[PDB]
Design an enzyme around this catalytic site. Structure first.
Site, short mmCIF file in Angstrom:
data_model
loop_
_atom_site.label_atom_id
_atom_site.label_comp_id
_atom_site.label_asym_id
_atom_site.label_seq_id
_atom_site.Cartn_x
_atom_site.Cartn_y
_atom_site.Cartn_z
N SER A 1 19.42 14.05 2.16
CA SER A 1 17.98 14.17 1.95
C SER A 1 17.24 12.91 2.42
O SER A 1 17.82 11.83 2.51
CB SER A 1 17.69 14.40 0.47
N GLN B 1 26.50 7.18 -4.36
CA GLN B 1 26.08 8.48 -3.81
C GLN B 1 26.58 8.90 -2.40
O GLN B 1 26.69 10.09 -2.12
CB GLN B 1 24.55 8.56 -3.84
N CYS C 1 18.40 11.74 -11.12
CA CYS C 1 17.85 12.68 -10.17
C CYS C 1 17.33 13.95 -10.83
O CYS C 1 16.53 14.65 -10.23
CB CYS C 1 18.85 12.94 -9.06
N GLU D 1 11.89 18.35 14.83
CA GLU D 1 12.69 19.18 15.75
C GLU D 1 14.11 18.73 15.62
O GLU D 1 14.38 17.53 15.67
CB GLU D 1 12.28 19.08 17.23
N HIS E 1 13.11 13.94 -0.67
CA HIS E 1 13.66 13.83 -2.00
C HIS E 1 13.18 12.53 -2.67
O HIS E 1 13.87 11.48 -2.63
CB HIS E 1 15.17 13.86 -1.89
N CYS F 1 22.17 17.83 -8.82
CA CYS F 1 23.09 16.78 -9.25
C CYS F 1 22.27 15.52 -9.56
O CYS F 1 21.09 15.46 -9.24
CB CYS F 1 24.07 16.49 -8.16
#
Ligand SMILES: [Cl-]
Ligand code: NA
EC number: 2.3.1.16
Lengths: 385, 391
Positions: free
Chosen positions: A240, A145, A93, A216, A341, A371
């Site tokens: 994300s 994760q 990442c 929204e 992401h 991270c």
């Protein structure tokens, strides 16, 4: 010999999974932004893409479209000068951020005068885990994760309410920055082939400029979303989004910059790629922040702006219980929860966001930290010039 | 801030496709070689694994075993400290060389005081192409305007360009085998190799359950001009056979770098410096003639001519790549690949770059000469050059 400075930085808008950008081959997406940062740069004085010496691009899932040194393949796809060297890099990442660290290195060594760091992830075209596959049908394993995000959360007393407050504010802060056009300068809008409900090109190629991920969002609404793990507190509205996007920063030796009419804009005060604790997997930002502050000779209080990547709300909340920052200076235009992401890109994206926000607000110092899978974490401290 | 210098370098022996090292997970092979270069430095000083700040590793086929940042997985696999950062790199065949370049920048930048550049390829376990899928030209985009051939085709195009015969490359391929057996029979690789514990396999490829120390390069084989002339071209009408091109191999290498100040501070003799480094683009039509440009670029960065260089390591991907490069730069060929090249020693792709630097260093030191050029062609029409100097 050399002193690296940023002379320009730009990003694609971040498209959603199968969204506005799913119609581009990953090599085009990247190449498009490679040429875009050189074009932006080439205005003040005559800089052309063949002035560039080397390109280093972060990309995580280096399979298919993203295999075979994509940084090289994009460059060529985009019809840019074939003499320019190119390397692609992987440290999950953080790859996008690491790419900047490396390019700085090369300038500092006097190896090059002009380089582009970048990152890419066409997560629509090439998805996570496409680079392994067969894998089966003391010495123990990293959590995945989502398990890490809950482990980090239990470690810090972080609660479902906590992370929902966060994801809501990430959405809000991004919506405000869009409304105000704070992204306008950093974004190079991209021509993309438009696909249909059947996934086939219509004839059209829309000009994509808005980050697709905004939505929204309400405390009540977040409220009834299902955890992704049975028993977890992270939902989808507090972790994300999978995305498409690419980003690129153009670096020079300051003297060469200055001599050929380009304005230096930022330097690196300190940089790091560090290991993290395997069990928590993604708490790495505690470690990387600690290391760059330590190297820089600075305290969290000296940093005007922080970009920390909202992989998951707990990660950021966990990093805040440790380094005790002012939340109003962290992810000020929202983050990955709201904006997305695209893993290989994010690290160059963040540096790009932060530099523009130091420029918009006339502030001095930014901390960037992420991270990363395999228990790594990247940190940088940049100073506006 | 920093002045970066090699304090240690070591490599595994190189093993044949399905050979002496095929019993090892790609991660274990690097892991062992990473551990070994650290180990060597500790014999002189207090230095240990956790003093390293970052590892950068090269590896081309970044699929499966070799994926998910093998540089890091490997480190963790060898039981080395988790606090060290790690990154894996791809500039194809040069990845192992660029890894060195890149560690040197991070030092020069003052980012790190201690780092490891390494390289790995376990082609037994993960083979060329395993990182793309079935339709092998869906990796480009349907706007690819450039004539970029496959590696074999390329070696034949270069061959035609220079007027290189089936004799020349067969003359060349023999001399690599001869120099490589001479270097070996003289124990020239002894200082540079650290011996690797490997599982033994049966006539299938199944582990017997016995470990062994591998210490020699498997690729040395008896070769004669006659034998070379009876081999069938890889391509119809081609001049290159399995005898005049590199061998699919397993191996790894790693080089330990430090700031010069920190090195002397911690007791270690600096062994060498980079004088000049490049990664540059090649003519895509020829694809693999890049060494011509990278040699030119680094020669200029440095201020020298080919004639200043004591020895060269140019990778023998194909006999013609080397002869094309010699026909353009006109070197003293007795000073080129003086211990043999990849035709004889093998070519574990991502590792070769660090391998070439380790070999090159070791010959300077064994001959008390000063300058070495390392140059390699790479896929994507690229080429790494490095000029190192003993210091
Ligand atoms: Cl020879
Ligand atoms: Na380089």
């Amino acid at each position: 010999m050399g002193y690296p400075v940023i002379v320009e930085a730009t990003r694609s808008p971040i498209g959603k999974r199968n969204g506005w950008l799913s119609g581009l081959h990953a090599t085009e997406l990247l190449g498009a932004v490679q040429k875009a940062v050189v074009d932006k740069a080439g205005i003040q004085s005559g800089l052309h893409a063949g002035d560039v010496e080397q390109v280093i691009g972060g990309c995580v899932t280096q399979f298919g479209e993203q295999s075979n040194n994509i940084s090289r393949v994009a460059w060529l796809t985009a019809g840019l000068p074939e003499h320019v060297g190119a390397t692609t890099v992987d440290c999950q990442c953080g790859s996008g951020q690491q790419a900047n660290h490396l390019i700085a290195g090369l300038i500092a060594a006097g190896a090059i005068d002009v380089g582009i760091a970048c990152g890419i992830e066409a997560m629509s075209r090439v998805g996570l885990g496409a680079n392994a596959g067969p894998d089966r049908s003391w010495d123990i394993d990293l959590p995945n994760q989502f398990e890490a995000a809950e482990r980090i959360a239990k470690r810090r007393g972080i609660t479902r309410e906590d992370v929902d407050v966060f994801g809501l504010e990430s959405q809000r802060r991004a919506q405000r920055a869009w409304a105000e056009g704070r992204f306008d300068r950093e974004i190079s809008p991209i021509q993309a082939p438009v696909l249909d409900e059947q996934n086939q090109p219509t004839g059209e190629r829309r000009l994509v400029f808005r980050d697709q991920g905004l939505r929204e969002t309400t405390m009540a609404g977040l409220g009834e979303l299902k955890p992704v793990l049975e028993g977890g507190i992270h939902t989808a509205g507090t972790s994300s989004q999978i995305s498409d996007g690419a980003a690129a920063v153009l670096w020079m030796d300051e003297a060469v910059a200055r001599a050929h009419g380009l304005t230096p804009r930022a330097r690196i005060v300190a940089q790091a790629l560090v290991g993290a604790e395997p069990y928590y997997h993604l708490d790495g930002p505690v470690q990387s922040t600690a290391k760059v502050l330590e190297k820089a000779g600075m305290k969290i209080g000296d940093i005007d702006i922080v970009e920390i990547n909202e992989a998951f709300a707990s990660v950021v909340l966990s990093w805040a219980r440790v380094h005790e920052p002012d939340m109003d200076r962290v992810n000020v235009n929202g983050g990955a929860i709201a904006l997305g992401h695209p893993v290989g890109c994010t690290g160059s994206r963040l540096i790009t966001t932060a530099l523009h926000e130091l420029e918009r607000t006339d502030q001095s110092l930014a901390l960037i930290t992420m991270c990363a899978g395999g228990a790594l974490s990247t940190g940088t401290i940049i100073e506006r010039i």
